[model samples]
Target chain A: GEKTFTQRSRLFVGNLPPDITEEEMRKLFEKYGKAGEVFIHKDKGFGFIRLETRTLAEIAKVELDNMPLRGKQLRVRFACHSASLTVRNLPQYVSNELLEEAFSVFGQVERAVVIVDDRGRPSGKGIVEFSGKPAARKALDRCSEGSFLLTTFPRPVTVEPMDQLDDEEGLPEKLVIKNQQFHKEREQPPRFAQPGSFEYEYAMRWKALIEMEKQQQDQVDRNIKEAREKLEMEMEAARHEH
Target chain B: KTYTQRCRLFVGNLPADITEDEFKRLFAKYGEPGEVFINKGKGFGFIKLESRALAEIAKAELDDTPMRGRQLRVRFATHAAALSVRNLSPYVSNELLEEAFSQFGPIERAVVIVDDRGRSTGKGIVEFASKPAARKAFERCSEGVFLLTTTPRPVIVEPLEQLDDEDGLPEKLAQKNPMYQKERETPPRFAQHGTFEYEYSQRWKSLDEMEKQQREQVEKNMKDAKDKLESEMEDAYHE
Candidate 1:
């Protein structure tokens, strides 16, 4: 039977020692409920562990919060879904075999990529998407900071959350509107002020400079806004046309 | 063993335009110049002399010599080689080091190492022109009292070694590895019709545009602030 949403759950566990094994993790959490899934991000120093139900997740948090594990204080709480938790940093030197070996400790890694820069250089950043969110979070907590998640290398490495906005393709329409309005206001005076007097002359010169600058800025802002809107609108219209 | 008395004198109220060469010239007139370093930015320097005899000569004669509209301080330089000493309790200035060490030979350089939070770590390095002069500094000033502190004792000095070669290896390995090299050569993959295509230029453009917008917004805000100040001044004058 296909697993229903009712049987899926997530819990956040923190203060994990870097070297805690998957077997030990399973043994500890299995008591509260059926441990359906676990994602331990060893570099993130925190990860998501899941039980069969919300009640089980609640139980796990209550039982495990502040529980000492491997000489460090732990913080356990119910995991909430965040769009930002989609990626993890991977060193460029990490091989496919190394990534599989590291990520397999939690769950199947669905997709992974090491981020790179414009000059064709590895940016020392990577993203790993998991088959399930619970397993992703679990992997993140266990290995982040002051812990040794067995990398191919000997020295301890820190893992942290990768920025999700990196993957977002375009600005939202509301942002475009605000930007346009800001530029429009910047280009004109606030309804009063004559020229030639010291006050009026200063005000006019300042306004003229501002308007010139705004004209240049607006040209750029409008181009980007229009480009993004064109792409979004074309995609939407294509979907309807099909 | 001959007993050596070392002292640390605070030289403050320096003129802004005073240079290191000028400082060396003024102190050399009193006696042999040992080591002299002026903090050009801060308007002060340290000058170490050969002996207490020469130190006294500069202290009495040059204490009130006006260079940049302020009286200079000439006294014994503090010894900063002790480990137990913390903070500026034994503040050693450039003038003190030059005056104390000048009797032996010309001093090369002297500086204090400060921690990340800008606190003096009570450790400093001083260099001398000749090995014999440096040896004399070690023999005469090591473990001697300076700046009224008894705990911070100076230890025997050794040449400082460069750590850049050892620290830079891992970075070089990461750069040259075949796997890392491949990752660098390959472009970013984009999802297209359920397949991935290497389309890096488009992806970069998208990211760069967002960052540019943020930069533009900040610049706009700064321009607005300057304009607002001008308008406010005008309004005040008219009223």
Candidate 2:
């Protein structure tokens, strides 16, 4: 089954009162049932709430959806788990339209794309997204064929649900190291090192600059010896396989 | 966590041909890794890097990178929170490491890497309770601040986010050396506060003495000049 993002009970609350405190929100949420984690964002005017149970979430949805909060209608919905499946080892010619066509038998696909490289050529990797969790699950099993993930895949195409840390997640062109310094270069505001973060780090600097140097290292003859050795070893392995 | 001492990264979609050593070698171009954990059965593990700066570069360099016709997914090992410390003088203790770093922030645990026989590897990991604390330690350690050795080896610090995640220690303990066995058990003999306090005080004392001598020299020079002027005026009167 496609793990990580399917049928979550966590609820995202929207249209919050700017004057609403976490205390006020928690009190209101507690009326439905025992509220779990309640995160109120006064700055963003929205927050998330985790109900004790899915049944409780259903009750909260009915009671709080469109319920008035300081003249604003409260918006309540289940936090959508990330439904995107990262599919790799794809044929270079595969297109998003082709992906949708291949996946049409399962159900309606939300989105699909074959990620391309710097030259705008297919990088033999793609992500096919579906709106329904069941469809995503079935699509994954088709690729898995009942073996544990990370061990098996459908002949050539490998598929797995790329887990998101949060619901407001989008996969990037590719993952880059994100430190506060890296965020300093982005649309995101300057960040700090938190535990599980390098807000204060020696490893927090212009990484891309080092990356450029590595690129130079890869291209120049300085690294030719190692490259040649790796190629030769690969050739030996390929020859042995045949 | 916003940032940490060492940023652990999750790498997936690897080519079957890519071995753990190859993974380490691939990242070594950026910076040496503190640890590389790979479970062939699960086909996923973690890499503890020296710094998030290189870890980020490693992620960028290795992301979607092809190895034996496979595209890899490289991302931060989210929620991993620990700091890696190095360049110790084989005298730094777990308690000392914890003591020095905890002043900046709260720590979950600190371990000075010990050998199978339990000798200090001169490298250790400090896991912080919160991401902010780890970041604080990261900045403090990265300042190249020497954290106290007999002669003073400037501690080179990085994040070892994997340290907080794994049970790599099937080793350590059962030692009675009383000194060489465990830093936590015995504590550093020569270096407590006495280590850096004396060294820094000695350093400051020399600077003070040098300044005093310079002041005395300048005063003597001024007095000699005054005497020369008076003597010259007396000679002119005699003439």
Candidate 3:
């Protein structure tokens, strides 16, 4: 009876926009149920959120999980470390407004925006921020599962989840990392060729990935300048309760 | 020619506002449609694809394409039968059914079964336009949970073939489908909502005990008073 009683309230939120805050998370999570606490890593483009109970957490995971938020589709998983989500294959015209509009229906928007390339254009990926664990969980599921009809993307354009490039394991450089043997190779030096300068290429890609995370993170922070303005127009049950 | 012919798709989770022409025009993007069948409810429809290759490609590109605020479920169907959907909200209409589930794929026809007096019985049958449409519809829709504003209990969808009796084809197929889970006595909201089910109810679902233990262990590490609720507050967040 004690074994299958409840799920973990701690959720791992991946693919976060650079500037999401603790307050916005509180506002969003309170919608499904009570949001207890949240921890934003700030530098890692991801974070954790603690819902008050497993019921709300499970419902949130079912309804909002993997639903789009902000400029990027969120990747919500169950863990203290699984709250953040990464959206890949964004269109060129991605914007915070669009993301905010896209994700607001699911939960409170802590952060939503796309990573810009060196050309100042939206790249193939983006990130979003939800209010708390429940809001985050609802946005975590499969493309084939429930919620978030990101099908509006033009033909040939698809939005899907991206694996977070933890500090130790960066961007993938191969076709398929299937088994244990393959995972060992996937962990080794990620193969890259930029004018035959693998080191520079690695550095450049790594910097871009890191910089993009911060750029979006800070971009979310930049949007904070508007939090004061948006708070006045905040639309949610949690907004007033707080 | 070998004369081996079978092709269709099942569409589910559609909004109840689309029309036949509009639905057909949208799916026409894949290839020349042989025929289009829209259901009578919110949204369920079937299409006769000119070729299986086109059907396969359409399944790939349009598997989860979001249409009209609904997350579309599209897959290759492989059966010839009518889909049985029960426990529908009384508010569920033929129009709503067509508008809702047809976007998953093609439907030969869809109807919300009614009593002789025409009172809505909350039961429906959707004949997919393709052979696989019924089979896929049964698989996908049976597991779908419909939260209705009109009803307190969430409505469950199921296939007609999901029978308990052993009068069907194979023993495996004849067995009760996981899709048609026994309806619990209490509604879900009664449990997960502010109720103490998170802590007390055995019916609660999720990763359960392992994650539950971890959360409590982390709470104990917060340096707070460990005196009260060693087991009670073991998981303040239990559900």
**Global lDDT of each model?**
0.48, 0.55, 0.48
Model 1 chain A: lowest-lDDT 10 consecutive positions:
A165-174
How big is the positional error of residue B116 in model 3, measured in Å on the Cα after superposition?
Answer: 57
Task: Supply candidate 3's per-residue lDDT for B130.
Answer: 58
Give per-residue CA lDDT, model 3, range A129-210, as digits (tens).
5655566555554222322323222211123443432211111222122455434322422122234343333333333333
Candidate 3 or 2, higher lDDT:
2
- Of the candidates numbered 2 and 3, which has the greater TM-score value? 2
In candidate 2, position B71 carries an lDDT of 59
For residue A48, model 3's alpha carbon misses the true position, in angstroms, by: 1.4
Q: Which candidate ranks first by lDDT, i.e. highest?
A: 2
Each candidate's TM vs. the true structure?
0.24, 0.25, 0.21
| Regions of candidate 3 where Cα sits further than 4 Å from its true position | A1-7, A80-242, B1-239
Kindly report the root-mean-square deviation of model 2 from the true structure over all alpha carbons: 27.4
Q: Which ten residues in a row have the lowest lDDT in candidate 1 chain B?
A: B161-170
Model 1: per-residue Cα lDDT over B213-239, one tens digit each: 766775787578656756666586665
Better of 1 and 2 by lDDT: 2
